[PDB]
Design a protein around this motif. Structure first.
Motif, PDB file in Angstrom:
ATOM      1  N   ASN A  25      37.234  29.539  40.318  1.00 33.19           N
ATOM      2  CA  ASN A  25      35.817  29.863  40.400  1.00 33.19           C
ATOM      3  C   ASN A  25      35.520  31.126  39.633  1.00 33.19           C
ATOM      4  N   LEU A  26      36.497  31.556  38.851  1.00 36.81           N
ATOM      5  CA  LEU A  26      36.364  32.797  38.131  1.00 36.81           C
ATOM      6  C   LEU A  26      35.099  32.696  37.278  1.00 36.81           C
ATOM      7  N   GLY A  27      34.762  31.470  36.879  1.00 37.99           N
ATOM      8  CA  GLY A  27      33.641  31.230  35.973  1.00 37.99           C
ATOM      9  C   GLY A  27      32.373  31.704  36.626  1.00 37.99           C
ATOM     10  N   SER A  28      32.228  31.393  37.908  1.00 39.30           N
ATOM     11  CA  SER A  28      31.126  31.913  38.675  1.00 39.30           C
ATOM     12  C   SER A  28      31.169  33.399  38.819  1.00 39.30           C
ATOM     13  N   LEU A  29      32.299  33.960  39.269  1.00 35.54           N
ATOM     14  CA  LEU A  29      32.358  35.385  39.676  1.00 35.54           C
ATOM     15  C   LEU A  29      32.194  36.288  38.476  1.00 35.54           C
ATOM     16  N   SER A  30      32.651  35.804  37.313  1.00 33.03           N
ATOM     17  CA  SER A  30      32.516  36.444  35.985  1.00 33.03           C
ATOM     18  C   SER A  30      31.078  36.729  35.651  1.00 33.03           C
ATOM     19  N   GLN A  31      30.169  35.929  36.202  1.00 34.97           N
ATOM     20  CA  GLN A  31      28.735  36.130  36.002  1.00 34.97           C
ATOM     21  C   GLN A  31      28.197  37.452  36.545  1.00 34.97           C
ATOM     22  N   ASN A  32      28.849  38.022  37.554  1.00 34.80           N
ATOM     23  CA  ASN A  32      28.472  39.360  38.047  1.00 34.80           C
ATOM     24  C   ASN A  32      29.537  40.347  37.599  1.00 34.80           C
ATOM     25  N   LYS A  33      29.333  40.911  36.409  1.00 34.23           N
ATOM     26  CA  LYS A  33      30.345  41.802  35.857  1.00 34.23           C
ATOM     27  C   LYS A  33      30.604  43.004  36.789  1.00 34.23           C
ATOM     28  N   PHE A  34      29.583  43.452  37.519  1.00 32.84           N
ATOM     29  CA  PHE A  34      29.746  44.617  38.395  1.00 32.84           C
ATOM     30  C   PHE A  34      30.733  44.257  39.507  1.00 32.84           C
ATOM     31  N   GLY A  35      30.662  43.004  39.966  1.00 33.99           N
ATOM     32  CA  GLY A  35      31.626  42.437  40.923  1.00 33.99           C
ATOM     33  C   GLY A  35      33.064  42.570  40.477  1.00 33.99           C
ATOM     34  N   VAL A  36      33.333  42.033  39.269  1.00 31.48           N
ATOM     35  CA  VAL A  36      34.680  41.920  38.722  1.00 31.48           C
ATOM     36  C   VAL A  36      35.195  43.362  38.545  1.00 31.48           C
ATOM     37  N   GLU A  37      34.338  44.246  38.055  1.00 34.45           N
ATOM     38  CA  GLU A  37      34.699  45.619  37.825  1.00 34.45           C
ATOM     39  C   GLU A  37      34.989  46.343  39.162  1.00 34.45           C
ATOM     40  N   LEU A  38      34.180  46.071  40.170  1.00 34.76           N
ATOM     41  CA  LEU A  38      34.432  46.572  41.530  1.00 34.76           C
ATOM     42  C   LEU A  38      35.803  46.132  42.051  1.00 34.76           C
ATOM     43  N   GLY A  39      36.177  44.867  41.861  1.00 36.73           N
ATOM     44  CA  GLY A  39      37.490  44.410  42.360  1.00 36.73           C
ATOM     45  C   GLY A  39      38.615  45.086  41.616  1.00 36.73           C
ATOM     46  N   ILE A  40      38.439  45.204  40.312  1.00 32.96           N
ATOM     47  CA  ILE A  40      39.435  45.913  39.495  1.00 32.96           C
ATOM     48  C   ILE A  40      39.608  47.341  39.985  1.00 32.96           C
ATOM     49  N   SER A  41      38.503  47.980  40.352  1.00 36.52           N
ATOM     50  CA  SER A  41      38.568  49.353  40.895  1.00 36.52           C
ATOM     51  C   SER A  41      39.341  49.406  42.251  1.00 36.52           C
ATOM     52  N   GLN A  42      39.274  48.329  43.039  1.00 36.27           N
ATOM     53  CA  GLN A  42      40.008  48.285  44.282  1.00 36.27           C
ATOM     54  C   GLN A  42      41.505  48.121  44.009  1.00 36.27           C
ATOM     55  N   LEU A  43      41.854  47.346  42.976  1.00 35.78           N
ATOM     56  CA  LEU A  43      43.251  47.126  42.613  1.00 35.78           C
ATOM     57  C   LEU A  43      43.854  48.424  42.057  1.00 35.78           C
ATOM     58  N   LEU A  44      43.044  49.195  41.332  1.00 39.97           N
ATOM     59  CA  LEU A  44      43.463  50.480  40.807  1.00 39.97           C
ATOM     60  C   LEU A  44      43.708  51.526  41.900  1.00 39.97           C
ATOM     61  N   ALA A  45      42.880  51.602  42.930  1.00 41.99           N
ATOM     62  CA  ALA A  45      43.169  52.597  43.978  1.00 41.99           C
ATOM     63  C   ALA A  45      44.528  52.258  44.636  1.00 41.99           C
ATOM     64  N   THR A  46      44.809  50.956  44.800  1.00 41.10           N
ATOM     65  CA  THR A  46      46.057  50.533  45.396  1.00 41.10           C
ATOM     66  C   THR A  46      47.281  50.863  44.534  1.00 41.10           C
ATOM     67  N   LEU A  47      47.183  50.585  43.239  1.00 38.74           N
ATOM     68  CA  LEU A  47      48.232  50.950  42.275  1.00 38.74           C
ATOM     69  C   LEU A  47      48.395  52.474  42.136  1.00 38.74           C
ATOM     70  N   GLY A  48      47.362  53.220  42.508  1.00 34.05           N
ATOM     71  CA  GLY A  48      47.479  54.688  42.630  1.00 34.05           C
ATOM     72  C   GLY A  48      48.341  55.128  43.824  1.00 34.05           C
ATOM     73  N   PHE A  49      48.223  54.429  44.950  1.00 37.95           N
ATOM     74  CA  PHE A  49      49.072  54.707  46.117  1.00 37.95           C
ATOM     75  C   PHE A  49      50.510  54.266  45.842  1.00 37.95           C
ATOM     76  N   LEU A  50      50.665  53.310  44.934  1.00 40.91           N
ATOM     77  CA  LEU A  50      51.969  52.761  44.639  1.00 40.91           C
ATOM     78  C   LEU A  50      52.723  53.485  43.547  1.00 40.91           C
ATOM     79  N   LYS A  51      52.168  54.577  43.032  1.00 44.62           N
ATOM     80  CA  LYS A  51      52.646  55.130  41.746  1.00 44.62           C
ATOM     81  C   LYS A  51      54.116  55.578  41.708  1.00 44.62           C
TER      82      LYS A  51
END
Length: 531
Positions: free
Chosen positions: A98-124
């Motif tokens: 369904n990425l095709g749908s979710l891709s339509q809200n770029k702010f969404g996709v960017e928000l999720g990426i930001s959540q993955l980054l905070a986690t990879l920061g704890f994992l450093k």
């Protein structure tokens, strides 16, 4: 297998029968915690001699790693292969289909990426090594969480050589391309692949192009990549990135502080409705809505203090809109809607009248009849004629909820009053509504007939022309509800006076109506022949 299963003996969770996702190393099942009935997700290892070390490291890291952003682990089991589990909070695997749908809200996709980054920061301090599409899950609050700890180890005192063999065996098992053998660059390179998979090259921010390429080739660290992106115009423009930070901090704010967060939510809803569409499920349904609902209840208690009562209508509009759109409703929504019906605010009640047909369901018929109708109906006696009219026009939509007393005794007593209402519009509509509901009363055809004849006779004496015209209308539509006997006994002389009305338009319509009733009577009379 001879040996009895850990899962079938004294097991703290129930597991559904069919996995929702499968991978070469794991099956992923919905489950529920037994004692609790807390919804959980059970990861069942496809344990074998070749992956056994990968499976065991994953179990161990699950047990020991407390990293916000990973799937929050509840318990592990490794005694029994084929009962080898990691049990976590209920998660949902990312809907790539369904990425095709979710891709339509770029702010969404960017928000999720930001959540993955905070986690990879704890994992450093750790190497993850397994970043892929299969890494990604959503928790109940719609936030992006990480799974897959097979290769995970601390960087301190870590042999590149040792890790590279594991990494090779892992990637060979998964039938996937090993991004590299370097533990210091494997995560950056795996992060690049994921971001590229999330965001097609025509949807990737211009100002992110170079940064993503850098990590894609393992030139820079994740933490370094993070500070660059945080600086870009894209990042700082994203209204969901900022709003999410407010939201997460909601419970450390004082009550005025929380109210600002909801005020911010409201302005974004007004100015950019679209930013709340095509998001990963959970944030709206299980984070935003229940927090608003909580803030709304507080304000509604404040309302009876006679602080921020002007936010009642806008916030409740959001909740009613978004709950309906997502077909989700928080625990106590029913109580929220009840409380809001008891509010004496007129603008609230107009809002509720608009959503009432949609509130039947979320709220049961017994709840509607029991807790909603008695306040709903007082709308007819309110001083504002527009609230009375709207209450009036809404009666047909809730009538299938009502008890027999409510419908067959009390309803018509209200309508008899609104038929003499000071407003002509309410008089006009009352006769329409009475025609409408006449056939759902639990009385006899005879009494239904008496109800109609009486209501139409009343309206055709009205001083204003509009309610007379509305009587003739309901009589035209009601002809099928009068057999010829009732026509002859009664209805002819309900119609006929309008033939003599001062208004030319009534006389003209009454004549046409009259003939049609006459024709019906004449036809039935002619067919009798038993002499």
């Amino acid at each position: 297998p001879l040996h009895m299963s850990i899962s079938n003996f004294q097991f703290p969770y129930t597991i559904e029968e069919t996995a929702i996702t499968e991978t070469a190393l794991w099956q992923c099942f919905d489950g529920t915690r037994k004692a609790d009935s807390l919804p959980v997700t059970v990861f069942k290892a496809k344990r074998s001699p070749e992956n056994e070390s990968l499976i065991l490291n994953a179990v161990h890291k699950s047990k020991i790693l407390k990293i916000p952003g990973l799937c929050t682990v509840l318990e592990t089991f490794d005694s029994d292969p084929q009962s080898t589990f990691i049990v976590t909070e209920r998660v949902v695997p990312f809907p790539w289909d369904n990425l095709g749908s979710l891709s339509q809200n770029k702010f969404g996709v960017e928000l999720g990426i930001s959540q993955l980054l905070a986690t990879l920061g704890f994992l450093k301090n750790f190497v993850l090594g397994t970043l892929s599409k299969d890494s990604v899950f959503i928790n109940i609050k719609g936030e992006w969480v990480l799974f897959g700890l097979e290769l995970c180890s601390s960087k301190e005192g870590l042999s590149a050589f040792e890790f590279a063999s594991r990494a090779r065996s892992y990637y060979n098992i998964i039938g996937s391309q090993l991004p590299c053998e370097d533990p210091n660059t494997i995560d950056s390179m795996g992060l690049g692949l994921l971001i590229k998979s999330l965001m097609a090259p025509s949807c990737l921010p211009k100002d992110w192009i170079v940064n993503v390429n850098m990590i894609s080739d393992g030139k820079i660290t994740i933490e370094n990549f993070r500070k660059r992106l945080e600086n870009t115009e894209t990042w700082r423009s994203n209204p969901l990135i900022n709003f999410y930070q407010e939201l997460r901090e909601l419970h450390i704010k004082d009550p005025q502080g929380k109210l600002v967060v909801m005020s911010n939510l409201e302005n974004l809803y007004l100015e950019s409705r679209e930013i709340f569409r095509n998001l990963t499920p959970g944030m709206i349904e299980n984070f935003i809505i229940p927090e608003l609902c909580e803030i709304i209840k507080l304000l509604m208690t404040q309302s009876i203090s006679s602080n921020a009562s002007h936010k009642l209508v806008p916030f409740l509009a959001i909740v009613l809109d978004l709950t309906s759109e997502t077909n989700t409703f928080p625990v106590g929504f029913n109580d929220l809607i009840t409380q809001s019906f008891k509010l004496p605010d007129r603008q609230v009640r107009f809002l509720l009248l608009i959503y009432l047909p949609k509130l039947i369901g979320p709220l049961s018929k017994s709840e509607i009849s029991s807790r909603i109708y008695p306040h709903f109906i007082q709308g007819l006696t309110d001083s504002d004629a527009t609230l009375r009219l709207q209450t009036l026009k809404t009666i047909p939509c809730i009538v299938s909820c009502l008890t027999e007393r409510q419908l067959n005794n009390e309803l018509l007593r209200f309508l008899a009053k609104t038929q003499v209402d000071s407003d002509v519009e309410i008089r006009t509509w009352t006769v329409i509504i009475i025609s409408k509901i006449s056939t759902i009363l639990s009385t006899s055809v005879g009494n239904r007939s008496n109800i109609l004849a009486t209501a139409f006779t009343k309206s055709l004496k009205d001083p204003q022309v509009k309610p007379r015209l509305a009587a003739l209308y309901g009589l035209e539509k009601s002809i099928e509800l009068f057999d010829v006997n009732t026509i002859a006994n009664k209805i002819l002389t309900v119609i006929a006076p309008g033939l003599l009305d001062k208004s030319p338009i009534v006389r003209g319509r009454a004549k046409i109506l009259f003939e049609e009733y006459l024709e019906k009577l004449e036809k039935e009379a002619q067919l009798i022949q038993t002499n």
